[model samples]
Each structure stands twice: as structure tokens, then as C-alpha cells.
Target: AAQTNAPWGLARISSTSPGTSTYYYDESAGQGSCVYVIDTGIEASHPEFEGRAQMVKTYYYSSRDGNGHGTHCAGTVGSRTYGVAKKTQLFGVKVLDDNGSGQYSTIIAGMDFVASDKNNRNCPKGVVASLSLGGGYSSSVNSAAARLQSSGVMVAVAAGNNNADARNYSPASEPSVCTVGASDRYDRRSSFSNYGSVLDIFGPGTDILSTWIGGSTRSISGTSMATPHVAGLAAYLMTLGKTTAASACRYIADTANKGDLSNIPFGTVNLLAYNNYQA
Candidate 1:
């Protein structure tokens, strides 16, 4: 594959400081729990993620990787050494196909699988979810996301990187969803990140290095980069005693650094709130 900006089409907007970076350390590495990932299936064999991925499940509904979007997104969320909760279990829900695309209905199917109570033997209850895809305001507040939230699953949706007039996309716009925005090394929101009241908080989503398919290591960009930041953090928080989605949101929101937030029309997001939790 061709190496694009930041390596995987996303930009490397900050310096790598490893565990010290926001959401990069294992505040709560999920020793006995798991998180749900609804996107392209991951290359579980990547050295950085090796035995770390305890697959709760894997669904392949797509057929191609036109630009490596899915793999790149997965790397940000689950890569062992580079992600938030490296040892946390990864439950893969592949709604997006290889071409890096999927319909809302297909996504709903993945949600149904996660939401199923009868399949507890296969998929456990109380799993957190992450989404790097969004359409528009309509996409931000989907019923699936709400149901997932109601079922006590925390979802970290990506605020679109389109820099649109809106602060966030569909599911992120949805009430109760912990919408995640992107921030730079100094904790400034990316110029291209969509923001507003819809922005719940921020994470390091600029140019981040992680494991990619074909045994390659690279960086990628987008709010897609931010979604995993929170996903891994949520997993960590789950280990810290904030078991419910609502409590996790409140803790993260309360601990946010509002002073340094970028007054870029919508609002500001705290990039380091998860670090304050009792570990």
C-alpha cells in the first residue's frame, strides 16, 4: 500500500510520548472485562496486538480495503502497545466492509448482536462500544447507539472530521452518547474537528502510530483516531469501578480541563480527564 500523510491517510499532529500521552496509558487495563468494536475486522496477528485480542467475536460483512481505513481504525483502538487498554478484550463487530464502508442497517445488525441477551454465552453483557464512522447529524443519534447506551454499554462515537457547521455527526449528536473530539499534543482541538455542545470530550486522534496489516507500522488521522482513545479509556474506567456508561461520562466530563479548551465555535473537550480516575 502507498504511504500517505501520517501513513494511513490520517495526520500525525503530535509527538509520541508513549504512556504519558493522553489515553495512551492503561489506567485500567481491563483484567476481567471486554469492549465492543463495531468496524472493520482487525489483523489480530499483528505483533503489537498479539494475544492481547481476546476476540469476543468477529463479523466480516465487507469484501475489500480500498484505503486501509478499517485496519487503520482498529489499530488506533486495540493495538497492544499503542492503544488505551492494551490487555482489554476486543469484541469485533465488523459492520464496515473491506472497502471501508457500511450501511446503517448493517451497523444495526452488529448492534443487535452485541445487544442480544440470549447470546450471553457467546457475547457477554456490559460491553463498551466504539464507532469511527458517522454520516451526519442523523448518523450521530441512531437508535442502535441509544439502545446500546440503555443496555449499559458505553459507546465512544467519532465527531466527524469534516469541519462542518455542526459540532458532531449522528450518533455523537445522540443524547447520552459520549462524543469524542480530537486534540493535539498541547491539548488543542484539531482545526478540522467538528465541535459544539455535541462534543463530550477530546482525545489524542491526530497522527498516532499503531500496528497495521501486512506487518506494517504507521500513523493515521481523523476523529476515527479519537474514538479509540476514549474506547480504551472507557475500558480502563470500567476497571476503576465506574461500571455504568452514565457514571463514566460524568466522571470524564467532570474531570475535563475546560480552561485550555479551544473556543472554536462549538466548545472544548478535556483531553486528559481519564487520567484522573482512581487507578
Candidate 2:
């Protein structure tokens, strides 16, 4: 019992060593990619969604998930068992309700229904939307999450738990989505997340675990569980080519790990998310 049961944010975002517990990843679980999960729905038979969870759209209530924070951010964006693109698909797109709060035009109507799906932004590692939900500012929910990041969608939202900055809110101060922030498994910085310069990295998020609602599996924290572990590592870097969403946010900030993580404050964004592995 000396560790390794996984989900230590999938063993600290795949590795790069900072004290893990085992989560090696890589056999291409992000498959064809596609992770909507805007939030507050999804329990699609649960069993870690072996059926590949999908709800398509709900708007405001009862298409299922009743409030498991969109089935724990769609089981950390994939769910084979608390995933990170472990065979990705997960849709849902509920647009907050069941007491989680919402109203930026119903969260931009789940970002214009995943920017008009059309088989999910014509994936090739495209369409990935996480959001995990935020609040208090909304230039019309930041231009409908910047027109679903110019339609190909790559949004990863939530740099909030209200520790402060995160530019002040709504689509985490929007700058065209991707925002995220939070860290743990000893890398630190998770005290309440929400950092400045509108974060684009730092995931893990404290006490995570996942897949809630009726099928079962729990543990939670905020930054809404670190924006679906960077939207399941940007859908495993869009099956490895970082397809789009601006080149997977420039390959997750040029393969993060930079500051290594700890208290991190002065303008945040020292990066962290990493899934390219290394340790």
C-alpha cells in the first residue's frame, strides 16, 4: 500500500517528477478526442463511462447528472477510471444548474452548444471544452467563450475558487479560454486557486478523485478540480499533434514544468500542467 493507485492527478500529470504515486499513461487513450463537459450534468451509466458518456446538450436541468459537477468534470475529462483522456469522448454540456449556479445566458448556452457541434468541431484532436464553471464577470460570457475559441473549440476554463485574481472571472477572464490553475500532489499552489495574469496552466487541483453522481466515486476540491486536468491534458494534446485550440495552447505552454510549483503568486503563470512526461 505504498501508493500508486493512480489519480494523484493521474500521478501528477504523468510525471516530470515532483513526488508521484504512479500514472504512466500513453497507450493513446484520448482516442479520437472530444470532451465538451461544460458542467452540471453527465452520469451516463457511469461505470467510468465505458459507453463513452454523451448527452450532447441540456441547457438547465435533469438530462441526468443532477449536479455532480458535470459528473465530476466528466470524470476528469475521459474516465476509464478517473481519467485524463483515457479514451476520450464525454460530451454532456449541461450549462450549470442543480445548485452549482449559472446565468451568463445559461453559460453562453453551453458555449453555443459546443460551438455548434457538427460532430464536435470536426475532430482530429479538435473540440475540447472543459469550463468547470466560474462567475462574476461576463462580457457576454467573454464573447461566448470567444466564439468557442473561433469554433474549433479548445477551451479549458476555471481559474477560480476565488483566491483572487484570475483576471476577475467569467470564462476565467476570457482571453480566449484555456485559463486553468491549481496544483497539488505536493507541487503545491492549490490553496484556493484563481491566480492572476489569467492562468493557462497549473492543474492537479487538490483532493481530486472523480466520477460522481449515482454510479459512485468522489473526492473534490476547486478550480473545479483544475479545469478537467487541463481538459484532460488538452485531450492528450489532441491525440499528440496538439491539433488546434491554438496548437493545444502552444503545446501547453511549450511543455510546461518551468517554475516547478509551490506558492506561486506574482502574476502566476509559471506553468505546471505537463503530460509529456519525463521523470
Candidate 3:
């Protein structure tokens, strides 16, 4: 186990103040659940992961993290030091390429693979599919996510960083997915975060610190950084043995903390994930 400055996302979920400074780390907090990161790829051997991360698919390059996005996202999902569900099994379903780009079809394929029986076995309780990438709306991706949800897998998507309407994006606009927006340290929506009725929740996304591509750590920003917090929460909830995609999403949203938004167009950006673990 390791320890680090408590990330805002973790603090928010834990219902702890940001000034807590440190979070004691344990790599087994999410032992019974799994999180599938549909992104570029992950550095499976990163020390922070402690071998809990695996490359499950490769759409472009070998699953060995050519681009750094996937690793960062994976860290947020399950890295011992910077993660939400610190002990959750982490599987990378690489859909993006070295250029950090991929076709919508590839993402859909990754989702399908994660929902398959073989992959489902790895997640006895349930699986949380975290997608940090998005393009314009795609009925195919929406349909794929819906199918996965029906199969008991929760999907968390980034409400794009464009500051425009998230309704213009694919999985974010998808009815069954949990769409996450970026919030700053003060809990206000990030200036660049897309806001709209389509978003389901908010998470810390600015200056987010997490494991990087080469056994290192870095801070990054974007709604991409926000999505995994929700995914991690979803995976953590599954470990409770009484959660489904719909139930987990509802619990998080309904129990969220409020009064964080100021100028967002949406009527309510009040749903921010809060930690419910009792010690």
C-alpha cells in the first residue's frame, strides 16, 4: 500500500474535506469488482497498479499504452495511490490509437467484449465501463451501452470538454449511461466542462493527479479526467454485492452533494458523488 495527497475526486466521494492532505492507500478496497477502461491503453506494469491492471483488448496498437490517456484514466479508476476503487480489477480495452484517436465502431467493439461472459466472469459483482473519449452522437455506441447496461454492467462517460452541450456527444447523450462533468477544487463546474441536462453527475477533473504511462505520475485536465471518478464509484459500489447499473447510478446521483454550480445552464448540476463507506 501507498499514500498520497487526497485527490479532490476521492475527497468528494469520501465526503472528506479537500484539506485532509493524505489518503492511506490499500490495493484491495475494490477486490471483488472490476473496471473496464475503454481508452488508448494502460501501463499494466505500473507500480501503482501492483499488477492489478491487464490489457484485455487492442484495437490499434498493442495494449501497452502508446498514448498516455488510458493509463491516466486507469489510475483514476484503480491506482492504489490515486484511484477511487483502489483494489478493483482494471482491464484496458484499447480503442484509441497512438494519435489518441479511434473510430466509434472500435469503442463499441470494446464495450461488447467487456460485456461478454468471459469478461463478466472477472467481475463477479459487476463491471464499470469508463469511457473518457467521445465524438458526435452515435446510435451504435448508445445501443451498445444500453445492451451492456441490460447485462448488469455500468457505463460512465465523459461529458466532453468542449463546454458545449453534452447532448451532442455519443455515450454522454446515451440515455442509460452516467455522464460526468468536470468540477474544480471549489466544486464549481469547470469552465471548459460541457454542461446540460444530459449530464448525470460531476467529478473532479482539473489538475487531477494519477499514474502515467511509464511508472510515473502526472496531473491532467478535461472531462476525460472526470469520467473515471464516476466509473470508480460504480465499481466500488458493486463490491457491496447489492448493486446493478441502474441501482448504482441512482444511488450516486440521488445521494450526491449539491450547491456546486453557479453559471451552468443546466437547472441542476447538484449531483456530485459522495463517499458512503463507514469505518
Candidate 4:
């Protein structure tokens, strides 16, 4: 086996929780859990995945990562070393193009595939959808996400990195999904992160290092990097028997580190998120 370094997001959470302290390289934490990364796509051949990644081409083109964004996001979600859930079964759903831009309809189509039991066998029970892309608010997208949540699919979306209110975005503003904002290593909200009453949690996103295209690794910045941390946490929780969306949401809320951050925007208080997974 090759040597691997754990990412900061995993380190922060494991340090606080006694039982979860071993999550950094624990391969048993997410054995039966499945996570779908909805973005440009993933480089299935990446060494970090170790042959555990599945690809679904929701677009006309192949579901191969060209734009590094999708592959990086997928790495944070479930890569063996970079991910919070090291053993999570990873799936890639391509919506965005190589330019890293796509229509809201494209995202909805990806979501439809993830939500469909016939199309996706590992969903609605112990699945988490990791969305790292965003666009203008779309009722159709929100409704589809909400429907998936109601049916037991956990979805986590990134608050846009525009430094404005997250409510201005579609899936992030949508009440159904778990909306994640970005925070630095010090637990302070990132300067570029969007904040608002709609935000669910904050995760480490600044200069995040993860698996990239071409079997390499790189560091990237954006709230996009933060979303997959929460998604990975959701899948980790599922393997521990927290299967329902509501229960997973509640556990996340109940266990989050609420103090230490001040001067939050939009009247948000204790907006920092921590996942100890301590019983």
C-alpha cells in the first residue's frame, strides 16, 4: 500500500470525537454507504479511489473528468485518503461540461437519475448526493432535491462562493438539502463563502487538497470543496445505522460545534460545523 495523508476536514472532526478519531484512514466507517457526486464527473482511474468509483454519464458526452473541479469534489467526498468516509462507495454523475458550466436543467437530470431507484440501485436508503456546482434558484431543482430527501436520500449542496446570501442560489437555498458553507482551518467562515439563514453547516474548504484529474492531486478553493465534506459525513453516518435523511440531519445539527465563531453575517450564530460522531 502507498502512504496517504488525511485532509484537514477529516482531521478537524476526528480530533473532537473520541470514537471517530480513527476516521482519517478508517476503511470500515462507510462500508455499506453510497455517495453520488453530481458535478462534471470523476476520473475513475484515479489511484485514490482504488477502483471503487462508478461513473454515470448524465450528459451527452462521456462521464470523464476534464475540468478538475468535478474530480476534486469527488475526491473530497469519498476518496480513500482524502475523504471523510474512506470506504464509501463512490458514484459520479456528470452534469457540467468541461468548462465547468451547465444549465440548471442538466443538474436536475442528474438528480433525477440519482433519485430513481430503477436507474440507481444504491439510493433512497443510505445514499448521499454531493453537489459542488450551483446556478440561479430553480424551483424544479429544489423540488427534486426535496423529493429525494423525503424519500430518504441525503443531499448536500454548496453555498455559492459569491460572498453573498446563500438564499440567492437554487439547491443551497432549497430547504430540503443540507446547504454547506466554507470555513477556514481556524473555524472562521471563509471570506468568499455565502451566508444566510438557509445555510445548514460550514466545512473546511480553503485550499483543500484532494484527488485531481490525470491521477494527480491538487489544492483548490471554493465553497464547492466544502459541500463534499458534509456529503461524506452523511454517508459515514449511514454506515453507522443513521439511514433516514431527517435523522442524519438531526444528528449533524445536534453534534455540530456551535461556539467560537463571531461576527457572522445574516444574523447567523454559531454557524461553524463539526462532526465528531461521538456516541
lDDT of 1 by residue, 198-256 (tens): 67777776676776667677777678878876776666667756655656766767755
lDDT of 4 by residue, 1-279 (tens): 122345666676555521222344334567777888889889989999988887866595677888989889889888877887777888888898889998888788788778784245654338888889887788898887787777667889998899998888888889878888887766678889888988887777887889999899999899999999888887787787754555675577677877655446756545555555443
State the lDDT of candidate 2 residue by residue for 70-121, as single tens digits: 8987888888768888787778877777887777787887788778874534
Error of 4 at 205 (Å): 0.9
* Best by the lDDT measure: 3
In terms of TM-score, the best-performing candidate is 3
Give the poorly placed runs of model 3, Cα more than 4 Å off: 1-4, 16-19, 23-28, 117-120
Q: What TM-score would you give candidate 4 relative to the actual structure?
A: 0.90
**How high is each candidate's TM-score?**
0.80, 0.34, 0.92, 0.90
Clashing pairs in 4: none
Kindly provide the TM-score of model 3 when superposed on the true structure, using C-alpha atoms. Answer: 0.92
RMSD of each: 5.8, 15.8, 2.2, 3.2
Error of 4 at 9 (Å): 1.7
Q: Where does candidate 2 stray beyond 4 Å?
A: 1-7, 10-36, 39-48, 58-78, 84-90, 94-107, 111-137, 142-157, 160-164, 173-180, 190-225, 229-261, 264-279
Q: List the residue pairs that clash in candidate 2.
A: 29-87
Q: Could you tell me which 10 consecutive residues in candidate 2 have the lowest summed lDDT?
A: 118-127
lDDT of each: 0.62, 0.79, 0.81, 0.77
Higher-TM-score candidate of 1 and 4: 4
